[PDB]
Amino acid sequence: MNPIIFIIILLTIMLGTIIVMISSHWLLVWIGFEMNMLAIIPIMMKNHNPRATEASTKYFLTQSTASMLLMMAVIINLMFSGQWTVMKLFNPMASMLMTMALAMKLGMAPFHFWVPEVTQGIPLSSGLILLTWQKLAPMSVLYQIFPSINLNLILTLSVLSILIGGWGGLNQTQLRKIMAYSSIAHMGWMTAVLPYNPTMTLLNLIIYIIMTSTMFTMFMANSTTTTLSLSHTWNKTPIMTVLILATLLSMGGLPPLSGFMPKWMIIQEMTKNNSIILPTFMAITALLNLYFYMRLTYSTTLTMFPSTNNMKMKWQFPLMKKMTFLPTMVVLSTMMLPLTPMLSVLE
Amino acid sequence: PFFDVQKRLGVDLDRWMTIQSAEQPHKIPSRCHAFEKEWIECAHGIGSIRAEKECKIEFEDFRECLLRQKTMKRLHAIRRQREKLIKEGKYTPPPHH
Amino acid sequence: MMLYIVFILSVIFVMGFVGFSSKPSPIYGGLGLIVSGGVGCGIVLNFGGSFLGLMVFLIYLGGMMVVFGYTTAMATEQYPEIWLSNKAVLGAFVTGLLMEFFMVYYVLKDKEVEVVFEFNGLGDWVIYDTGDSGFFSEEAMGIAALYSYGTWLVIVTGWSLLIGVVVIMEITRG
Amino acid sequence: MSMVYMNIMMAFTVSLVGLLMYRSHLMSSLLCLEGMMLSLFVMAALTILNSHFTLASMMPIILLVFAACEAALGLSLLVMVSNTYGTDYVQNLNLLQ
Amino acid sequence: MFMINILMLIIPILLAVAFLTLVERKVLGYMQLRKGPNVVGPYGLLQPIADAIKLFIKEPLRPATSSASMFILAPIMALGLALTMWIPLPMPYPLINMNLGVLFMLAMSSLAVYSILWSGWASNSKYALIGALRAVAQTISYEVTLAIILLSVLLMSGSFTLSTLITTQEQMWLILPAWPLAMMWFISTLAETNRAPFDLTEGESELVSGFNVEYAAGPFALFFMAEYANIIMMNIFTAILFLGTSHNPHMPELYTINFTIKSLLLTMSFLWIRASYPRFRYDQLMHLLWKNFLPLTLALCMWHVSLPILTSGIPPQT
Amino acid sequence: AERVAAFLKNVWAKEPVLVASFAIAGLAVILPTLSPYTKYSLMINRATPYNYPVPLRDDGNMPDVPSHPQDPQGPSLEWLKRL
Amino acid sequence: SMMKWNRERRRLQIEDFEARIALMPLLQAEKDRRVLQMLRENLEEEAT
Amino acid sequence: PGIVELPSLEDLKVQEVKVSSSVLKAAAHHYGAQCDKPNKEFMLCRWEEKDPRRCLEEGKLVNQCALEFFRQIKRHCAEPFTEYWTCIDYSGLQLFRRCRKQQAQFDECVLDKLGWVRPDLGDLSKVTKVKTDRPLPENPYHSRARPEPNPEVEGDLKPARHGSRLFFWTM
Amino acid sequence: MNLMLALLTNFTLATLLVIIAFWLPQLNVYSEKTSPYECGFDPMGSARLPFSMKFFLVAITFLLFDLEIALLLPLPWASQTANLNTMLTMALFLIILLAVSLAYEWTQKGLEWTE
Numbered sequence A: 001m002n003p004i005i006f007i008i009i010l011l012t013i014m015l016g017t018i019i020v021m022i023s024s025h026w027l028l029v030w031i032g033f034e035m036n037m038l039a040i041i042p043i044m045m046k047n048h049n050p051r052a053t054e055a056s057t058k059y060f061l062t063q064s065t066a067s068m069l070l071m072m073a074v075i076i077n078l079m080f081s082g083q084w085t086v087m088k089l090f091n092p093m094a095s096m097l098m099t100m101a102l103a104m105k106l107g108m109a110p111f112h113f114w115v116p117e118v119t120q121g122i123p124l125s126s127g128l129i130l131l132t133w134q135k136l137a138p139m140s141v142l143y144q145i146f147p148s149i150n151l152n153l154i155l156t157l158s159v160l161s162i163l164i165g166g167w168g169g170l171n172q173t174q175l176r177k178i179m180a181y182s183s184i185a186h187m188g189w190m191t192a193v194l195p196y197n198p199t200m201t202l203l204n205l206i207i208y209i210i211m212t213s214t215m216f217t218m219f220m221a222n223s224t225t226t227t228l229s230l231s232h233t234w235n236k237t238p239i240m241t242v243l244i245l246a247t248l249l250s251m252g253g254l255p256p257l258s259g260f261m262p263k264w265m266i267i268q269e270m271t272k273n274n275s276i277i278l279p280t281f282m283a284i285t286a287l288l289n290l291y292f293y294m295r296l297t298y299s300t301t302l303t304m305f306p307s308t309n310n311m312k313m314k315w316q317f318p319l320m321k322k323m324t325f326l327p328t329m330v331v332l333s334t335m336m337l338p339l340t341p342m343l344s345v346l347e
Numbered sequence B: 001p002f003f004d005v006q007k008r009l010g011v012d013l014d015r016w017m018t019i020q021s022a023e024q025p026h027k028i029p030s031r032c033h034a035f036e037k038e039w040i041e042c043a044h045g046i047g048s049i050r051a052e053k054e055c056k057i058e059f060e061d062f063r064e065c066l067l068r069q070k071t072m073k074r075l076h077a078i079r080r081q082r083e084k085l086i087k088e089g090k091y092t093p094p095p096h097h
Numbered sequence C: 001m002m003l004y005i006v007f008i009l010s011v012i013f014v015m016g017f018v019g020f021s022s023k024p025s026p027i028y029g030g031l032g033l034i035v036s037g038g039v040g041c042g043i044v045l046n047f048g049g050s051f052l053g054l055m056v057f058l059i060y061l062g063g064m065m066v067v068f069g070y071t072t073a074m075a076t077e078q079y080p081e082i083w084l085s086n087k088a089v090l091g092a093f094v095t096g097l098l099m100e101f102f103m104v105y106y107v108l109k110d111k112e113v114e115v116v117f118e119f120n121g122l123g124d125w126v127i128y129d130t131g132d133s134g135f136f137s138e139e140a141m142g143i144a145a146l147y148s149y150g151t152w153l154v155i156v157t158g159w160s161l162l163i164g165v166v167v168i169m170e171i172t173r174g
Numbered sequence D: 001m002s003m004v005y006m007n008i009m010m011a012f013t014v015s016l017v018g019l020l021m022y023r024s025h026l027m028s029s030l031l032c033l034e035g036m037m038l039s040l041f042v043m044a045a046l047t048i049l050n051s052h053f054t055l056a057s058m059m060p061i062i063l064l065v066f067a068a069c070e071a072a073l074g075l076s077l078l079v080m081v082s083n084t085y086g087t088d089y090v091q092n093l094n095l096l097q
Numbered sequence E: 001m002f003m004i005n006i007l008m009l010i011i012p013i014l015l016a017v018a019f020l021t022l023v024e025r026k027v028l029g030y031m032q033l034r035k036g037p038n039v040v041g042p043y044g045l046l047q048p049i050a051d052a053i054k055l056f057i058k059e060p061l062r063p064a065t066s067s068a069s070m071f072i073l074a075p076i077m078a079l080g081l082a083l084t085m086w087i088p089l090p091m092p093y094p095l096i097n098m099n100l101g102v103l104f105m106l107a108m109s110s111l112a113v114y115s116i117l118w119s120g121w122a123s124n125s126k127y128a129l130i131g132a133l134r135a136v137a138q139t140i141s142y143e144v145t146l147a148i149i150l151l152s153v154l155l156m157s158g159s160f161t162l163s164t165l166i167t168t169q170e171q172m173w174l175i176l177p178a179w180p181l182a183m184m185w186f187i188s189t190l191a192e193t194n195r196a197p198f199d200l201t202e203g204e205s206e207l208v209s210g211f212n213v214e215y216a217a218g219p220f221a222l223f224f225m226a227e228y229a230n231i232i233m234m235n236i237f238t239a240i241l242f243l244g245t246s247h248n249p250h251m252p253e254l255y256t257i258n259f260t261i262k263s264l265l266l267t268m269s270f271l272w273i274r275a276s277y278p279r280f281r282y283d284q285l286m287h288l289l290w291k292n293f294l295p296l297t298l299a300l301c302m303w304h305v306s307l308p309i310l311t312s313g314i315p316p317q318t
Numbered sequence F: 001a002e003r004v005a006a007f008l009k010n011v012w013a014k015e016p017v018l019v020a021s022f023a024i025a026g027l028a029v030i031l032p033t034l035s036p037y038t039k040y041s042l043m044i045n046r047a048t049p050y051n052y053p054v055p056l057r058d059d060g061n062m063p064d065v066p067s068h069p070q071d072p073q074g075p076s077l078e079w080l081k082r083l
Numbered sequence G: 001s002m003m004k005w006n007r008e009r010r011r012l013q014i015e016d017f018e019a020r021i022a023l024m025p026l027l028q029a030e031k032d033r034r035v036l037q038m039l040r041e042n043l044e045e046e047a048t
Numbered sequence H: 001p002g003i004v005e006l007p008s009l010e011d012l013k014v015q016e017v018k019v020s021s022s023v024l025k026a027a028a029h030h031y032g033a034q035c036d037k038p039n040k041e042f043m044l045c046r047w048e049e050k051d052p053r054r055c056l057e058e059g060k061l062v063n064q065c066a067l068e069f070f071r072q073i074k075r076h077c078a079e080p081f082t083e084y085w086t087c088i089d090y091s092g093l094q095l096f097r098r099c100r101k102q103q104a105q106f107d108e109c110v111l112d113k114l115g116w117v118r119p120d121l122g123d124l125s126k127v128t129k130v131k132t133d134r135p136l137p138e139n140p141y142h143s144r145a146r147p148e149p150n151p152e153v154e155g156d157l158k159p160a161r162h163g164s165r166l167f168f169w170t171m
Numbered sequence I: 001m002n003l004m005l006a007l008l009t010n011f012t013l014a015t016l017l018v019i020i021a022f023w024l025p026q027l028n029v030y031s032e033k034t035s036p037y038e039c040g041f042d043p044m045g046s047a048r049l050p051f052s053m054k055f056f057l058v059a060i061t062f063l064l065f066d067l068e069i070a071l072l073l074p075l076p077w078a079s080q081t082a083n084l085n086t087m088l089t090m091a092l093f094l095i096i097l098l099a100v101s102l103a104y105e106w107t108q109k110g111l112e113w114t115e
């Protein structure tokens, strides 16, 4: 891939997301989704190996099916309303189809099976796009149709995502599958608060993106994709292990780290609506996420695993990866709890 | 939209196609033009929570124009009865019907 | 009987879908899809969309022609499967036709049928517009407005088609 | 609703079940995807034509344009899957278990 | 009176096709310094009848490995669709007056391709398969260029109605303002009809007989009839598209006379071209269309979009 | 101007088909700007009456609106009669 | 030549379009009466 | 939901202009000039009332002026007019351009006898004013009273009292 | 109706000719006569074996080009718009982007058949 071609394709991925976000017409929203899927597959196939081919095919089949259900909902909405405006849907069957269509696009459980596999099959840079940028467009549509979403359906997906994400991460030794299951679990929190306060869905989304972007950027820096490969970081870049520790604890929602904020704010919103059993269940089940974050901090930062002799050759060479924005993202990933009231800007 | 860049910049990218009461080529009106306009003008500015309740009449009529469900039920009721009366030798259609 | 023209075409429409949804050899799946495109064009034509109908037929005829070529290269086996050659294909094919027949039988037996949702079986002509005396086609004016009104739609569609060429070449350059 | 909708909606459902219930050939599933667009195209056209909403008469055309892109995208992936395993069978795409 | 009209269309077509085979054999004979049929009937006039009778009393064959239903279906589509291509032709009055006759013929011509694909495939023999996939290649070559060539011409006519092409050319043939398009259209019709130098799906010297190598007797005859009916129809369409005949509503026969002469001469030129050139290689046909005709057709399409506007010559919708 | 001529003449010898295409494509883009007739195309499209000309309710102060189709007031198509 | 003929055809189209405009008031009046008569006929049959 | 009010069959009866479309097309241009005033008032009524029942009376004056128009042609120009629409009737598209010679004969006949002048190209497509005594309809859409708008939130914007007031935060 | 009548007659005549062709001639069917043809010697393998497509990339590009015509075919109607300034710009825009896509595939050797 010619560098100019990569930029144009990369700009098209953003263009499709932006089209969804600025569109007031259901057709243009669907077009934006198609444009996004068209441009992301070549990024997935960038390295041209059988695994990347499998991931791209599994991704394409899933996203195509969601687009069909989404467009079906739009046409049903047109029959029962005669209009195309992006807003609440006027038919409950259309609401179900759109909600499920967006659930597949996000990778929410039980439409989650593709997220672990696609993420594992593609490079880290592509996985970063998949688990962060690709969340924006479906969430922005959910942010506009939520008044007509069936409450039981959306909360059922949120609960299942948190459980399935929590349990799925416990068995993983690959860093890309850990980030996939962690992503599934975090998506559950975003949609659980969606019916009550959409602002806290945006807050959780932004903070999830900052923390996920930081973790992928640190994995890219040392070119690590397994738990054991990451366990050598202490012997080359000690500073990196400390940043991984702080970021991982934040992702686990431990105060006083930034990652505690979205969980804190979502519990507040749910209790204000006399929803007590669900936030309690959610917070406890999120302890599964913390458990398999803590294993990574054990093998990465708090202990020292054995090295290999050839590691000494890497002591003589500096990191040359861009690590774009890493110093800023890690500070935002960890030291933002004192600034929590700034969430009103999202209002 | 999520980001209303269209309103901010004043450009009009897709609002033109959103409703059937908007300006059409050569002013060809849609079949339910009047019903849409009434519902859009009833609910303008007051929000969906209020509009769901205070514009049911306008919406209910508009829905009838779109899918004609009440009308077709009425015709099936009339047609079904004629079958009963024609088949019983009770009513006879006039020449023009 | 002729008043039910659109319904009769829609019955063949579903039957074509059962043809390729049962998933025999893609040679026969393509045939099923060509039929559905044909009577699908007929359905849209009978609603006043001659241009829309003929084009979906034209586009799908070229698409299945590419599919036929790809089937002989990448989706062919020694004994391509017909609807009668496989129990899973025949079972799906039979199931879809019986589910189609019964829906037809009730809606014709009663002039209404309930299949999850209420459908009126009075014939599709009853919903048509009564008056009409414009000296033009409405579909043509609406479609032709893509270039005056649909400036934004042309940009996004033109870009996507251009990117599509760039993308397919990246994907297929191993 | 009108009776045509019953069969067009049924057609979409048949292809949806067709897509979700795989066999071996990945090509067969790509046809079920083109089947769903065909029914979506037809059902959109009936609604738009019947209601006399002129400006959306271009909507079904745009629908086909982005169906062609998906089919071209799907066929491209099938080329690379076939070049790897020598068939388009979907059971070969299980490295990532 | 409409059924009689249908028979007055298709029976003469089958007679014209029968005698086109005689005219082809004679014209090629004399261009090859020989005579061609002149024994069976005076000047070979009974030769087409003898060939027709002989084929339909010859034994048909169903190959052992063939797919029966598609094997028989394919020749029926071929002849059925070939005759369907004639119903919208204004001669000067069409049998069926369509708003979109031009697009109807594009759709039917695309459908007629499958009578080649399915006959070659259903035959389940290698030479048949090779011929069938050449048909796939040939359609990919010309279909995109053919439609855009038509669109450029219709931008001067303003309509998709075939009868409006008669009105557009009332003062002058469209070949004057569009001879570059007429050139590329004429080639495209040779490719579209699998005619030499683009007779590739059959390609005698390479594929024995190509897509219909396994067909015999009557089923073979239907394919042969369909081919020659398509030759005449596409030259009528060329004559209507570029050599418009003036129509007098009170003397419609005079249109039909001048119109027929032009179509005969254009059909004669197909035979003339067959006697003159070697065959293309079928990847060279793809490059001819995509690398030469397509860039020029795209440019002329923009030119003919702009020209009516900049000259204020936009035609009417009617 | 000499470097371009060598390239231009070179492509006339190797790819005359592409030289002709770009030239025609260039004319399709430029001439509409420089043509004195392009303005009339929109006026003729404007003057074609697809719809009924709905009358206006006369209120008393419409000097330029005609009362009868043959009255002098209103747009005239004399420019088109002579075009 | 194509320019000049197509200008004439546009002039001929307007003339044709103006004839329809002249008759539209008469046809519209007939249409209104015809629709109302049909409905009134429908209404009476429905009563019995 | 009400019983649709439909007029009586006597209130709908009128003398019908029972001539073919080729007859109407032949006389359309002169008919447009001669019967403009009743026609324009009737068309103003339909696009204002939006109801065929509210315009019946003006729709009868359209026919009475059409019959009077065709009665004058019969009195003075029956034969020249009869050739002309016959020529129009022959054409499959009823084209004017195929009957220019006969159109002339009818055109100078109505000029000499009746003083009628043919409208120029573009005349019949003008938007014209029309005086009427029918009052302007006030609720032609039969709209209900619209819901009241939400009471406006206005006044002077002051800082939030004690800031965000989020848990412990003092700002 | 007329069109449906015309189509039925066309395919009815074709089917009648096939029926006559199959039931009029005297038949003598045996295995060697109906065996697959291949120049006198038995076929070597199945004709259902995969047949590689060398123009596969052109075939996919045809699907994308074959939809440009649907977008361009409305042009004769679009030329009747009042807003010709916007028209001509958008019509020329589409064709140029189609030309650019063709140039890209051409310059990147996408139209060359694989060996």
Ligand SMILES: CCCCCCCCCCCCCCCCCC(=O)OC[C@H](COP(=O)(O)OCCN)OC(=O)CCCCCCCCCCCCCCCCC
Pocket: A238, A239, A241, A242, A243, A245, A246, A249, A256, A257, A301, A302, A330, A331, A334, A335, A336, A338
């Ligand atoms: C104020 C409001 C906000 C409140 C939220 C909490 C704020 C803290 C958030 C921290 C954000 C991450 C930034 C942490 C900076 C860590 C700097 C450091 O520890 O020294 C790095 C040291 C490098 O070792 P060296 O080889 O000598 O130097 C190479 C680099 N030039 O590395 C090492 O050599 C150490 C290797 C052994 C690993 C020891 C692990 C246990 C000690 C970790 C302490 C940091 C814990 C951070 C976790 C969050 C704590 C709240």
Ligand SMILES: CCCCCCCCCCCCO[C@@H]1O[C@H](CO)[C@@H](O[C@H]2O[C@H](CO)[C@@H](O)[C@H](O)[C@H]2O)[C@H](O)[C@H]1O
Pocket: A076, A091, A092, A093, A094, B069, C117, C118, D001, D009, D010, D013, D016
């Ligand atoms: C995943 C498979 C997807 C398959 C999709 C199949 C087609 C789906 C059709 C969706 C439209 C069905 O529409 C469903 O039935 C009728 C439609 O009048 C409605 O019927 C009901 O709702 C309306 C509400 O005013 C009233 O008539 C009344 O309350 C009741 O009749 C339902 O409220 C609607 O939800």
Ligand SMILES: CCCCCCCCCCCCO[C@@H]1O[C@H](CO)[C@@H](O[C@H]2O[C@H](CO)[C@@H](O)[C@H](O)[C@H]2O)[C@H](O)[C@H]1O
Pocket: E309, F029, F032, F033, F034, F038, F039, F040, F041, F042, F043, I084, I085, I086, I088, I089, I092, I093, I096
């Ligand atoms: C990579 C992207 C490539 C994008 C390329 C886009 C190329 C577009 C080139 C401009 C095409 C239109 O160019 C423009 O056409 C209109 C005519 O319609 C002309 O406009 C002229 O005619 C119109 C009506 O026809 C009159 O209303 C107007 O008074 C007059 O100026 C403009 O003078 C000309 O500048």
Ligand SMILES: CCCCCCCCCCCCO[C@@H]1O[C@H](CO)[C@@H](O[C@H]2O[C@H](CO)[C@@H](O)[C@H](O)[C@H]2O)[C@H](O)[C@H]1O
Pocket: E291, E295, E296, E298, E299, F015, F018, F021, F022, F025, I095, I096, I099, I100, I102, I103, I104, I106, I107, I108, I109
């Ligand atoms: C707006 C419509 C009209 C504009 C024209 C649009 C289509 C433009 C087509 C691309 C033109 C430039 O791109 C093309 O790239 C290839 C590189 O492989 C060049 O070079 C190649 O072409 C020719 C034919 O294939 C070969 O003989 C040559 O060996 C090879 O180098 C072509 O000479 C050039 O024409």
